[PDB]
């Protein structure tokens, strides 16, 4: 999946490494990626690979209560992960269905 590597590279790598190409173009930096595909076709694989190569902190969100104390003890809201994401920015928050 090389064309897919290329697209994810654009939308993830370029905004965080070269936030000047988008400024010159005059378009807001992309901030949302969604990966179609049957199970085990490389979605999580490519997300992790792009995060690793870009040096972004890959934060996997799954809703498990086993990690709710790590997110925040009184986690009545899912946006409380954003403090962690900001602290470890640049960050890539990955959800899987």
């Amino acid at each position: 999946l090389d064309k897919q590597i290329k697209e994810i590279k654009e939308v993830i790598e370029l905004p965080v490494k070269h936030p000047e190409l988008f400024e010159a173009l005059g378009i807001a930096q992309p901030k949302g990626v969604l990966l179609y595909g049957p199970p085990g076709t490389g979605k999580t694989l490519l997300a992790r690979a792009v995060a690793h190569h870009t040096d972004c902190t890959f934060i996997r969100v799954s809703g498990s209560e086993l990690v709710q104390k790590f997110i925040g003890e009184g986690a009545r809201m899912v946006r409380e992960l954003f403090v962690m994401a900001r602290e470890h920015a640049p960050s890539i928050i990955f959800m899987d269905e």
Binding site: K9, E13, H18, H53, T54
Partner: protein
């Protein structure tokens, strides 16, 4: 398929041939080397080779190759800068790895090494790091840089340990066996070659025919009779490739089943090709001596006494020649017998292995004690 033949070892083979005194002037070897040089635009390597071999520099060809190389380097530096500015880390790495690859393809050792070090610094993939390390190892084989070889071998082992790429582990086994053959470590060369005989894929170094030839040679000179029987004489892949090979199969099987004097024509022909080969060249005398000693020991082991006449008849050689050879080896201490000359007869004996182990211990301890004492003088004062 194998890794790319960027530092083509065939070029090193041809250079070694042209360095030999019976081929310093070989028209075919020179023409093929020049074909490779003009096809790969080896301008720096061509200049260095002309200097070393005293040839006359073909100024026109050298200038055209130099212009081609300069154009390529300029274009590829432009690509690298474009990747720096616009594209991302992967594109940067690809461009600068291509620069290192071309610096190899034009035989520029130092520039290629520096480019590879920079690429390894800027690379994040373990497999790509292993590719760079194998590039460096092939450069080390090409230029017989022992320090480079050992450093990159340790680096490759460390990189493989994590990741556990068995394909890369087998490739490193082949490379390390080649290095062991180069440095005359035939025991480890045979061990690695027998490990990787059924999984050989490194065609960047040499063909499977040559690989099996080297494996058979090192196995004969290193392994004992039981191990040789189990590995070489019965390995299915070795037997098939030896069916393809008419000569080395005869050599190995003659040694194994005691057909003597045919072992010696085989040893003569293999010695000639060993001398021709760049990898085995500064060990052919040692290999032949060791193989002759092995044959004599094999013949003498199963007999309390054996007339020099019978020895000569078995080996096809004359009595005087076999007597002098046997006496030389006995004086060297690598044969467990003595020879009575008034009535020619070779009488064997069985010295306990404790004596051999004591002699080896004294020798190795003397080497290490000399090293330790040298270190002591270096430090204390």
């Amino acid at each position: 398929e194998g890794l790319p033949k960027n530092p083509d070892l065939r070029i090193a083979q041809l250079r070694f041939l042209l360095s030999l005194p019976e081929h310093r002037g070989d028209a075919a070897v020179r023409d093929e080397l020049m074909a490779a040089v003009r096809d790969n635009n080896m301008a720096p390597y061509y200049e260095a080779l002309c200097k070393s071999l005293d040839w006359q520099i073909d100024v026109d060809l050298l200038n055209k190759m130099k212009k081609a190389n300069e154009d390529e380097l300029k274009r590829l530096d432009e690509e690298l800068e474009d990747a720096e500015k616009n594209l991302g880390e992967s594109e940067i790495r690809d461009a600068m790895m291509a620069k290192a690859e071309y610096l190899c393809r034009i035989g520029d050792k130092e520039g290629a090494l520096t480019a590879f070090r920079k690429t390894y610094d800027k690379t994040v993939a373990l497999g790509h790091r292993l590719d760079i390390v194998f590039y460096l190892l092939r450069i080390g084989l090409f230029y017989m840089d022992n320090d480079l070889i050992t450093r990159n071998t340790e680096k490759a082992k460390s990189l493989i340990e994590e990741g556990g790429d068995w394909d890369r582990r087998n490739r490193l086994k082949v490379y390390q066996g080649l290095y062991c053959v180069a440095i005359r470590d035939f025991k480890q060369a045979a061990e690695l070659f027998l490990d990787t005989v059924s999984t050989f894929t490194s065609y960047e170094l040499m063909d499977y025919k040559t690989f099996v030839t080297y494996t058979v040679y090192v196995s004969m000179i290193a392994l004992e009779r039981p191990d040789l029987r189990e590995k070489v004489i019965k390995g299915a892949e070795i037997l098939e490739v030896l069916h393809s090979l008419p000569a080395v199969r005869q050599y190995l099987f003659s040694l194994y089943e005691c057909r003597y004097s045919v072992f010696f024509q085989s040893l003569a022909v293999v010695e000639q090709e060993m001398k021709k080969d760049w990898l085995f060249a500064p060990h052919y005398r040692y290999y032949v001596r060791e193989m002759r000693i092995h044959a004599y020991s094999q013949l003498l082991e199963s007999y309390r006494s054996l007339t020099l006449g019978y020895m000569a008849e078995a080996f096809g050689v004359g009595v005087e020649f076999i007597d002098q050879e046997l006496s030389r080896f006995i004086a060297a201490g690598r044969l467990h017998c003595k020879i009575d000359k008034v009535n020619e007869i070779v009488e064997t004996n069985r010295p306990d292995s404790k004596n051999w182990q004591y002699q080896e211990t004294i020798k190795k301890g003397d080497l290490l004690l000399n090293r330790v004492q040298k270190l002591s003088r270096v430090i204390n004062m």
